[PDB]
């Protein structure tokens, strides 16, 4: 209702002092040209601000400011967030946080991968183990039949079964679920040692 | 090794029947001319599919093609993922999918909470209803003392109170913790409200 | 000084095994020859490796290996690795932050859908309605003027004025002669409206 | 027809109370001229709601109203509601979805972790390593013609040639003057290779 928000409107008047604490207001009989509205709706703005005890009201006798601490707090009524649109603002605010979360997080990742796949580059000769856990008809089967070099590029340098660690295993070495196998070779033969034992 | 690389070439050859399982390779003496390497590049390339039993080989007598499932077999084991750059592609697709669910979901929510906004706008006398279960100074006064309507935009239609809805409760009544109020407004109103009694 | 030197090959060799666990390593002057240093510099390694607990001087029989782990981690420092520790905390951390903010944005939808929606209790809550198309003392006057809940009952919740539905219209709205007026109360309440407004 | 109005209205009544729960509601002719319908019109409406089980003629006493809850449900299709019950399905699968993604992300980030970084065991699995810079007739062969772990008990992984480091270069590599070989295998494994190339 427009008569409430003059009552609004009054009100920070109040709160900035151009309508001081205690002093009847001054321009009571133009209070409605300040506001652009009519003379009935500043009246009704005013009992607003009477019923909330920020002014006193007699007719014939002028509207004085008894609160400004009331006109304060009755202005932080309309501060506060509220309403559906905002609430909406909110979560879209969320969303547009997350985007960036989300972009920031693409080039972390970037970074941390690329360099991570750096990280054997100066060790060729640092091993990968691979434990024989699954099944796989690749067990039971000696080094010399498995042609793994053939097959992943990689070349075993060691192998641990039954809790021994054999170096240079050969190939008549025969490999049993459970062992772990060790090798030397570059990150695709990881991925193909892993995949033939699968 | 290039060697190696020539290998799943030859195999490839085989695979495609160019060099048809059960005859010795007719183009033996030029099969290195095939792929662009020497002779010896070539020479290792047969001995690493006789190692697979893809082919035999015998000085002097030729090179037979023995197996071409097992060649098909060899080049899956090239076929498939491996290696720290294809897992990186793999981890920048989950990135690149997460990007487009996020934008697909900002549309959904946005079209949701617009129209969910419009949902009371035909049910202007619908209440909305508020529990005061919180602590405030606001419990234990009157509805005239509270002055609901200047501070929120809303209207007290009821009450419930020790379990007895009280419609149109008017100003003598007081509220309580416990309480329920029922009101009109707009969704302001109902922020405001909320703030009030918080 | 180049200590790194120094406790870069020591740590390697604690990794390799050349310097068992639990045993004394190589005096401060022997280290100082084997990496060309000071044995200033070398003294300056074994206190960092030291204060890092992979030697351990506190037996007062030389420097006794304590942690090949902790070796390790003094190598990663150099190494391809040295920071993928704190980037994957990053990384983490961002993680975990999207999943609570995925729940955060659930929790506000929510409350907006609960807020939005009707609640549809059983009470009469739907308002009586009248059309003051007759002549009174009460019309042209603010609502509170009228002191209606005390004279009626009843509680105003619109007012609809030359077409406009002013809900909520508040305590002072006019009441002009043609408005519809909307209350909440029961059929005594109407009744004393009807009669309040000369009907 | 216009059954939706017959159905619509006596929904509205339903959660209004003008229908109570458990009580017949009016005569199929009698919604009928209500609603300003054909008697069919009604008739195609209560069947409507009574496959909702909003209403129910088991009891062969006319029609019994049994739940306000669907009617509710049953308004809401004609409502602003009408599809923000499958618009929050709709997001809520996206929501559990991408929080399901993440985790899969983090899965899948480990596993690179794992598979890049160093596993730095204790065995000696550092290579030897042997400039083959004499002449010998098992120079400038496949390596395979030397059954190398047959005769020296070494596994080569890797081959130094004009300065390229051939890591993994495998069976029929030829191995030739000026190579730097590289094999793990114990300290007899060394100099049976010494032997074996001349050195």
Redesign the interface.
């Known amino acids: 209702?427009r008569?409430?928000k003059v009552?609004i409107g009054i009100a920070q008047r109040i709160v900035d002092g151009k309508f001081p604490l205690g002093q009847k207001i001054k321009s009571r009989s133009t209070l409605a040209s300040y506001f652009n509205v009519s003379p009935?709706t500043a009246r009704?703005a005013i009992?607003?601000l009477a019923?909330?005890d920020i002014v006193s009201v007699r007719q014939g006798s002028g509207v004085i400011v008894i609160s400004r601490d009331k006109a304060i707090e009755?202005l932080e009524?309309?501060e506060?967030?509220?309403?559906?649109?905002?609430?909406?603002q909110?979560?879209?605010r969320?969303?547009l946080?997350?985007?960036q979360?989300?972009d920031?997080?693409?080039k972390?990742?970037?970074?941390?991968?690329?360099?991570?796949?750096?990280?054997?580059?100066?060790?060729?000769?640092?091993?990968?183990?691979l434990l024989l856990d699954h099944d796989s008809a690749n067990l039971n089967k000696s080094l010399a039949d498995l042609?793994l070099?053939?097959?992943?590029?990689?070349?075993?340098?060691?192998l641990k079964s039954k809790g021994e660690?054999l170096?240079?295993?050969?190939?008549y070495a025969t490999v049993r679920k459970g062992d772990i196998l060790?090798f030397?070779?570059?990150?695709?033969?990881?991925?193909?040692m892993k995949?033939?034992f699968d």
């Open positions: 209702m008569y409430q009552a009935e009704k009992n607003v019923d909330l009755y009524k309309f506060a967030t509220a309403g559906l649109k905002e609430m909406k909110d979560i879209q969320s969303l946080k997350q985007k979360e989300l920031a997080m693409n972390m990742m970037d970074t941390f991968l690329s360099q991570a796949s750096l990280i054997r580059k100066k060790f060729p000769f640092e091993p990968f183990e042609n070099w053939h097959q992943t590029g990689a070349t075993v340098v060691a660690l170096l240079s295993p050969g190939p060790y030397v070779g570059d990150d695709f033969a990881f991925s193909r995949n033939l």
